[PDB]
């Protein structure tokens with residue numbers, strides 16, 4: 001029964017463009033990480049101590065700061081994104097920034113030891129570094145289920161960039177104006193994604209895969225709300241702002 005329309009010229013172009021954008025804004029060598037404030041790991045095998053030292057916060061806050069910059073850059077090259085008013089571009093970036101960081105980071109997440117391996121022991125990031133940045137297990141552990149859940153999809157890079165683009169261009173975000181444009185843009189991306197999956201993804205018995213990807217967008221919303229909860233409390237720490245960046249302040253404040 002399953003019809004399998006071919007990717008259209010436009011759709012193939014969309015994928016090309018998104019692949020090129022990701023390649024321009026996601027360095028797979030991580031050769032910039034050494035420019036961040038150094039990571040510090042001082043023994044904590046304590047919430048009080050966490051908040052007292054915040055040893056990993058300057059380094060991780062720089063990594064998130066750097067990644068938001070990469071994401072803004074990635075957004076600009078999503079076809080259609082420029083046609084939105086800049087006010088709406090900003091709503092979408094601010095609200096998706098942490099979700100996209102969560103998707104993109106999957107390129108460094110390894111199931112070998114359940115860490116984000118960007119090195120080089122110093123830029124290997126584990127659960128325990130996240131807690132050393134002042135967050136708790138209630139965000140960290142689902143973030144790790146999410147990462148694993150996502151590795152096991154074995155996404156083609158075509159789908160991976162399409163999923164970040166769909167994520168960013170979501171019409172149902174607090175404060176959007178032209179929800180209809182965003183939907184129109186998002187729909188251009190989803191249809192491309194649905195078409196690709198049924199042309200280029202084997203077996204296939206997976207009409208399943210699209211649904212699983214859409215569910216990942218939904219897990220992301222929960223994590224986002226929990227990140228935000230925990231950021232709000234993190235910022236109650238005196239002189240915490242110095243350990244952040246102006247951009248992390250604005251995006252999450």
Ligand SMILES: C=C1/C(=C\C=C2/CCC[C@]3(C)[C@@H]([C@H](C)CCCC(C)(C)O)C[C@H](OC)[C@@H]23)C[C@@H](O)C[C@@H]1O
Pocket residue numbers: 057060061063064067101102104105106107108109116118125130133135143231234248252
């Ligand atoms: C960010 C990336 C990378 C790893 C991401 C990571 C690993 C370290 C902790 C992070 C950063 C979370 C914490 C909870 C964020 C804390 C932020 C703050 C202190 C402001 O509250 C968000 C996130 O999810 C994977 C985490 C490496 C590479 O794959 C590029 C990608 O761009």
